[PDB]
Structure 1
Amino acid sequence: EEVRQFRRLFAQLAGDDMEVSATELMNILNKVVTRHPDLKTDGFGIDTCRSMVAVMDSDTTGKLGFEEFKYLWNNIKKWQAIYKQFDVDRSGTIGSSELPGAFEAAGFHLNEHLYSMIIRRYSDEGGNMDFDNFISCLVRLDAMFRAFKSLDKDGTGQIQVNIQEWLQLTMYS
């Protein structure tokens, strides 16, 4: 079945310690993104991969276990289609005007100010965002949203943290 062979794929990629490290993730991500040329990218760099891993490392093993990796993979599959769908000009990248729809389709409703911050940090001098940047951003964004909600189950619209929780959440990303 599908679930069957994916479980094997993970075991195979995880290797010796049975979890996927940043280096492992980076290698598989690159090799795969190469088969999809319609997704322009300068590649997944090691640093970007270390951020995605840490931000996905809920059990703080330093690496990705099966579920974490599964969560991340599905997300990438989904965000991958949304990327192509919204690249209406077939530039291979997500433009400043295509982004909002892309993010919203993915399920993230941001306001003008947040979108501008996103462009500034994850898009190029031309307001364009390649694929590794797009995926990297959504992973982090999705994770920051979840972190917020979990610390505000009482839904007051505000979370309160001491300096150690803060550093943990901001440095481990």
Structure 2
Amino acid sequence: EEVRQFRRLFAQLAGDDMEVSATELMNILNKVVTRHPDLKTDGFGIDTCRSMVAVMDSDTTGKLGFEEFKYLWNNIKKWQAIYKQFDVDRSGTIGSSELPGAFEAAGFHLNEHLYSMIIRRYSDEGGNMDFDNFISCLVRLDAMFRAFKSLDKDGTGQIQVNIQEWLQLTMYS
């Protein structure tokens, strides 16, 4: 079973402290892309990985527990399929014209202004986004959507955030 299969994966990846650190995450993500010649990437760097862990570390242990890793891992597998699916010219990267359809397929309906800002921060000079950049951006987008949703208690579409909360959300990510 996939549940039995996942505990085994996590158990082996987590190791001695029973949690997945940024380094352990980096190593497994780099092993995976190595098996996919259709995914162009300069590799998952340690900083990108420290960022992914921080943003997914709900309980501030500094590392990823079973549930935190299960959530991240399931998303990455779903997003990896979308990436292959929307790279219609097989450039191994998500071009600017390919980006909106890929994000929308992922469940994020943004606007032209936001898509342009995403491209300015996450794509290269040619306007192309490689695999590690794509996954890194989606992990953060999903987390920022979840953070806003949880702060929007009244369902008014506006949130109030104090300086302490602001610093915690932006610095630990």
Map of 1:31 onto structure 2: 31
C-alpha separation in 1, matches of 2:64 and 2:70? 9
Map of 2:51 onto structure 1: 51
Cα deviations across residues 47-91 of structure 1 (Å, max 9, x unaligned)?
000010000001111110001101011101000010000000000
C-alpha separation in 2, matches of 1:150 and 1:102? 25
124-133 vs 1-10, which moves further: 1-10
- Unpaired segments ≥5 residues, structure 2: none
C-alpha separation in 2, matches of 1:162 and 1:153? 15
C-alpha separation in 2, matches of 1:149 and 1:92? 33
In the TM superposition, residue 155 of structure 1 has moved relative to its aligned partner by 1.2
Query: Percent identity over the alignment?
Result: 100
39-48 vs 2-11, which moves further: 2-11
In the TM superposition, residue 143 of structure 1 has moved relative to its aligned partner by 0.1
In the TM superposition, residue 129 of structure 1 has moved relative to its aligned partner by 0.1
In the TM superposition, residue 37 of structure 1 has moved relative to its aligned partner by 1.2
Cα deviations across residues 16-75 of structure 1 (Å, max 9, x unaligned)?
110000000000000111101101000000000001000000111111000110101110
In the TM superposition, residue 127 of structure 1 has moved relative to its aligned partner by 0.2
C-alpha separation in 2, matches of 1:155 and 1:30? 40
C-alpha separation in 1, matches of 2:139 and 2:149? 16
Q: How many residues align?
A: 173
Q: How does 1:1-173 map to 2 (within 5 A)?
A: 1-173=1-173
Cα deviations across residues 112-170 of structure 1 (Å, max 9, x unaligned)?
11101100000000000000000000000000000000000311111111110000000
SS state at 1:90 partner: coil
129-138 vs 148-157, which moves further: 148-157
C-alpha separation in 2, matches of 1:9 and 1:153? 37
- Unpaired segments ≥5 residues, structure 1: none
Query: What is the RMSD of the two structures over their aligned residues, measured on CA atoms?
Result: 0.6
C-alpha separation in 1, matches of 2:107 and 2:65? 25
C-alpha separation in 1, matches of 2:164 and 2:9? 37
C-alpha separation in 2, matches of 1:78 and 1:2? 15
SS state at 2:104 partner: helix
In the TM superposition, residue 5 of structure 1 has moved relative to its aligned partner by 1.7
SS state at 2:160 partner: strand
SS state at 1:129 partner: coil
SS state at 1:3 partner: helix
Normalised to the residue count of structure 1, the TM-score between the two structures is 0.99
